[PDB]
Amino acid sequence: PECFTANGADYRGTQNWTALQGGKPCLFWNETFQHPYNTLKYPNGEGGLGEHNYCRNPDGDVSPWCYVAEHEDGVYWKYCEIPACQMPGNLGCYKDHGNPPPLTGTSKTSNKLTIQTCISFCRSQRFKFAGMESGYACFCGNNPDYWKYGEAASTECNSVCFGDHTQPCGGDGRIILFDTLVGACGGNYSAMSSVVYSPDFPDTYATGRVCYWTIRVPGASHIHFSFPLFDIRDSADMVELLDGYTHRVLARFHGRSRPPLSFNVSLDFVILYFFSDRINQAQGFAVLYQAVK
């Protein structure tokens, strides 16, 4: 996994094509004096801008994109379909035809529709998969076959949402799939190696959020942790690592503390604590773990 964000804002890859099969090359980020995004005004990164032609996202778009060579046909920029750019919990986009929908369940329409509102609408009714299309949709379901109409390209399903303007809400006749596990408070996690997001991950986290993520594995030796994404700019809210046998605290992370990229614990009953505040909320976490058997 390379993209731990719903729009691919943190994507540092070396794909200098728009698509790997039947694509046109991307222009360099230093040969683009004509357009307002180049390294001549954004040095030292600013989304990732060096002397390359990689598919970045500096403007807060719904997907990574590059500058294509203008062939006197209008469009001078295309979306880059990155196969290894999907947050764990994003199944992909699929087609939507008619009276049999891909997700047999309840539906909801709204004038403000982000990813997390639909995920919470599908989760508060005990459904497994979420889904949305054309900006205003929320299709819940529990069926194991949601690909009955085929899988579509990720560049096709990049219509913007309504409550937020940096998230892709599928497209016209194209539904984007999500799991209901992302952005929740707590879950009996017993898989081998999963990901844990903060509450209301595609949005900002709410005020007064506190939950318990329990990690139990059937007899592994030790667990391995990692912290791909971490952005909290306040001194009140904090993440903790707890032990549930005699209730001792392993580690205490804060906004002013830079956490290590990886460390080890020889335990299998890990507890996660997260006390929110009421003053400032910017972004959550994307803790990825792995258990060693």
Ligand X SMILES: *[C@@H]1O[C@H](CO)[C@@H](O)[C@H](O)[C@H]1NC(C)=O
DSSP code, position 196: E
Residue 273: both structure tokens together? 């604590």
* Contact flag: residue 28 with ligand X (CB under 6 A): yes
- Residue 160, Cβ neighbours under 10 Å: how many? 14
Strand order in 238-243's β-sheet?
A: 187-189, 210-216, 269-275, 238-243, 248-254
* Contact flag: residue 14 with ligand X (CB under 6 A): yes
* Contact flag: residue 36 with another protein (CB under 8 A): no
* Contact flag: residue 111 with another protein (CB under 8 A): yes
Q: Do 152 and 95 form a contact (C-beta atoms < 8 A)?
A: yes
Dihedral sign, CA of 72, 75, 77, 79? negative
* Least distance in angstroms from the C-beta of 287 to another protein: 31
Cα–Cα distance for residue pair 81/153, rounded to 1 Å: 7
Using CB under 6 A, which of the segments 167-175, 195-203, 257-265, 277-285 binds ligand X? 257-265
Q: Do 46 and 205 form a contact (C-beta atoms < 8 A)?
A: no
- Contact string 212-251 vs another protein (x = CB under 8 A): ----------------------------------------
* Contact flag: residue 98 with another protein (CB under 8 A): yes
Using CB under 8 A, which of the segments 3-11, 96-104, 211-219, 258-266 binds another protein? 96-104
Q: How many residues bind ligand X (CB under 6 A)?
A: 13
Strand order in 222-226's β-sheet?
A: 195-197, 286-292, 222-226, 264-265
* Least distance in angstroms from the C-beta of 79 to another protein: 15
For ligand X, which is the closer residue by CB, 71 or 126? Answer: 71
- Contact string 135-154 vs ligand X (x = CB under 6 A): --------------------
Among 12, 24, 35, 97, binds another protein (CB under 8 A): 97
* Least distance in angstroms from the C-beta of 166 to another protein: 10
Cα–Cα distance for residue pair 57/5, rounded to 1 Å: 11
Among 34, 107, 190, 207, binds another protein (CB under 8 A): 107
For ligand X, which is the closer residue by CB, 192 or 282? Answer: 192
Dihedral sign, CA of 134, 135, 141, 144? positive
- Contact string 147-186 vs another protein (x = CB under 8 A): -------------x----x-------x-------------
- Look-up: residue for tokens 């719904």? 62
* Contact flag: residue 14 with another protein (CB under 8 A): no
* Contact flag: residue 134 with ligand X (CB under 6 A): no
* Contact flag: residue 128 with another protein (CB under 8 A): no
> What Å distances lie between residue 281 and 33, 115, 142, 181, 277, CA to CA?
36, 18, 33, 21, 8
Breaks, C-N > 2.5 A, in the chain lie after none
Interface residue list for another protein (CB under 8 A): 22, 95, 97-100, 105-109, 111-112, 125, 134-137, 160, 165, 173
